[PDB]
Amino acid sequence: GAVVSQHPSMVIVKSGTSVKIECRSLDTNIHTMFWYRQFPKQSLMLMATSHQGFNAIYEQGVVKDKFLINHASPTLSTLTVTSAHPEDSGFYVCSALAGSGSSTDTQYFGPGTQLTVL
Amino acid sequence: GAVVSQHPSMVIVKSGTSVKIECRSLDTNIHTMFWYRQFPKQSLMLMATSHQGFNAIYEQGVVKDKFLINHASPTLSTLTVTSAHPEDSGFYVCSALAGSGSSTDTQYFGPGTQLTVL
Amino acid sequence: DNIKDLLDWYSSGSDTFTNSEVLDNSLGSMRIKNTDGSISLIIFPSPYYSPAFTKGEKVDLNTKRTKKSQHTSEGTYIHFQISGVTNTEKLPTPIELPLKVKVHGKDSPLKYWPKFDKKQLAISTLDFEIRHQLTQIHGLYRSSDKTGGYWKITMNDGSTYQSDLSKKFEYNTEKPPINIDEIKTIEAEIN
Amino acid sequence: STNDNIKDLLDWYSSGSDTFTNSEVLDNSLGSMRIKNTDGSISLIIFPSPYYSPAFTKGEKVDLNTKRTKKSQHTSEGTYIHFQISGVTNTEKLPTPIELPLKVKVHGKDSPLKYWPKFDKKQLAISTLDFEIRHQLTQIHGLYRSSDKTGGYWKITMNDGSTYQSDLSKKFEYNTEKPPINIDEIKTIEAEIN
Numbered sequence A, B: 001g002a003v004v005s006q007h008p009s010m011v012i013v014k015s016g017t018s019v020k021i022e023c024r025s026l027d028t029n030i031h032t033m034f035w036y037r038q039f040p041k042q043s044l045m046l047m048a049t050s051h052q053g054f055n056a057i058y059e060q061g062v063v064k065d066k067f068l069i070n071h072a073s074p075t076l077s078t079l080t081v082t083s084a085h086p087e088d089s090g091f092y093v094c095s096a097l098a099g100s101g102s103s104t105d106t107q108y109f110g111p112g113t114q115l116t117v118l
Numbered sequence C: 001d002n003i004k005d006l007l008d009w010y011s012s013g014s015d016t017f018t019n020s021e022v023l024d025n026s027l028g029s030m031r032i033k034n035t036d037g038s039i040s041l042i043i044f045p046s047p048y049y050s051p052a053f054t055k056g057e058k059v060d061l062n063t064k065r066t067k068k069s070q071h072t073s074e075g076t077y078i079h080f081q082i083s084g085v086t087n088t089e090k091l092p093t094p095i096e097l098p099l100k101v102k103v104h105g106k107d108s109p110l111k112y113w114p115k116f117d118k119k120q121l122a123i124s125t126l127d128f129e130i131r132h133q134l135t136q137i138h139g140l141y142r143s144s145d146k147t148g149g150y151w152k153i154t155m156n157d158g159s160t161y162q163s164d165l166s167k168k169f170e171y172n173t174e175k176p177p178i179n180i181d182e183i184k185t186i187e188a189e190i191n
Numbered sequence D: 001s002t003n004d005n006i007k008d009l010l011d012w013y014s015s016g017s018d019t020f021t022n023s024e025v026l027d028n029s030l031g032s033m034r035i036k037n038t039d040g041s042i043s044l045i046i047f048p049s050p051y052y053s054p055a056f057t058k059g060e061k062v063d064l065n066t067k068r069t070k071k072s073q074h075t076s077e078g079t080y081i082h083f084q085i086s087g088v089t090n091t092e093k094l095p096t097p098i099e100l101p102l103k104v105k106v107h108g109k110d111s112p113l114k115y116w117p118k119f120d121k122k123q124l125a126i127s128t129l130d131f132e133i134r135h136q137l138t139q140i141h142g143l144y145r146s147s148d149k150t151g152g153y154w155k156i157t158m159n160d161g162s163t164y165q166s167d168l169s170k171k172f173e174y175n176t177e178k179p180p181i182n183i184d185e186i187k188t189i190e191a192e193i194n
Helices: C003-010 C123-137 D009-013 D126-140
Strands: A004-007 A010-013 A019-025 A032-038 A044-051 A067-070 A076-081 A090-097 A107-109 A113-117 B004-007 B010-013 B019-025 B032-038 B044-051 B067-071 B076-081 B090-097 B113-117 C015-025 C029-033 C039-043 C058-070 C078-082 C090-095 C099-102 C116-118 C150-155 C160-164 C183-189 D018-028 D032-036 D041-046 D061-074 D080-085 D093-099 D102-106 D109-111 D118-121 D153-158 D163-167 D186-193
Touching: A004 A090, A010 A019, A019 A032, A019 A090, A019 A113, A032 A076, A044 A067, A076 A090, B004 B090, B010 B019, B019 B090, B019 B113, B032 B067, B032 B076, B044 B067, B076 B090, C003 C123, C015 C039, C039 C058, C058 C123, C099 C123, C123 C150, C123 C160, C123 C183, D009 D126, D018 D041, D032 D061, D041 D061, D061 D126, D102 D126, D126 D153, D126 D163, D126 D186
Parallel strands: A010 A113, B010 B113, C039 C078, C099 C183, D041 D080, D102 D186
Antiparallel strands: A004 A019, A010 B010, A019 A076, A032 A044, A032 A090, A067 A076, A090 A107, A090 A113, B004 B019, B019 B076, B032 B044, B032 B090, B067 B076, B090 B113, C015 C029, C015 C058, C029 C039, C058 C078, C090 C116, C150 C160, C150 C183, D018 D032, D018 D061, D032 D041, D061 D080, D093 D118, D102 D109, D153 D163, D153 D186
16 A cells, blocks of 8 residues: 655766656555655755645755656656756655645655766 | 767666666767667677667667667657666667768767666 | 745746647637647636637647646546747747846845746746746745745836736736847846 | 568568557548657558558547658658558557467477567557567567578467468568457467578
């Protein structure tokens, strides 16, 4: 009841490129996927929350065109970091929650994906 | 005089997944992008030649379904290895030539991409 | 108050499609088929902006959703959007629209202010793009000293448009898309 | 000899192919269909067979598993156009991808398959079955790559005993192609290279 996958598990790209990273969940309902960004030597931080048929709602410091979120199919959410810069290097982790509740409602995490930008 | 990039430079992924590798060129012609594979300890071999407007033509041992090539524009050839198994891990390199030549024409290589399948 | 509604609207993502096909166009409504090949049902409440694009013409979208996009039997993913339809005229290369921000009377350097490759953008789109820059980098709606202000465009010909930051874009007031290469300055002040 | 059927058969069958799902029919009129794909691509597709002649009308959704008859071209509007031949079917899917029962022989000996794909459509065109079978044969089993292997046949048998056969020494007869079949009803596929 809710496993969440990610793809790739690590990618190394050149400056200025755009990198597409994936969050998968087989079963079943899932009304929100969240995306999180951990910098090296730093904390895991919410970047955005994507409600199921809406555009994602971005946290402070995150811009939609720099970290584009596409919740294309109901089980697949993609994040793409565009115009990649070394400072975007980090672990990117998604996570799902199961409706409805709020608040006092469990979050299932992906395994995470390492981006390194040269 | 045709700098061909590849994207990404390295990617580590999980078994059964599919993995998109890009081949970019700035200018401006290019009728043919070539895809090559190198397994550990082995030669850099040709797996497909792609003439723009046609489906890629595949060498012995390489099937369209496991290595899908999309060459819409002369900027972008993409190779996608589908159902990734550990034995697909290797180094993937594209190259690009323009007019006229054949055959003793000049072939410009991408910087290659490292695929690891876990 | 309504400042949280403003935040979720402007701090959120947007839809951008290139080269979609019109199948229906009336008063303040368009049914557009995108290249994915989703359906977009887009309303145009402003009498001063009803795209004249006819069935089969190509259009670009830079729109926000009015509610939940719908379902799938065939994987077809119907969107319910508002404004933001333009022509497909592209610029030779992407340009950065000149935008300067001030809070509170002090310069606030830009970050991830993107470039655009299109000749025209809807005024609603410039709004939600300017404000998104503002909500994401400059504290708009996120702090109590940062709830209002303005943004203001100035065209090469002296024309100015100004939008009050403390109120939502008035979509029923909206005029036709402008050539963004004709924009001289954009200024934004959260004060 | 010079003017060789082969290297022509090898470049057709060793080549990739176009697969689109949930394309839409723009038109069907003079033995050809005009079709919109879901990557902002368009397809003009010919059907030269009196026995396979799609009845899909404007607006209906179709699946494409097809081959290119000549170079595709860009336009403006600004879209890619393809020129293909047959392999337009309904969009009815199988709940799970299935492997079609192919057995190959090379030199009278069972030849293990590799990268033989699974299918999730109820229907495939016989031409489609054909370029899939031959692609498996050209890429894994040496068909058209040494004089050794330049002929042979493939034979598909349904559950009800009706059969489809094609000689590998020849090109697929598009002009006399029969209608698509329910691939879940295929009993065996046998290929032999001689």
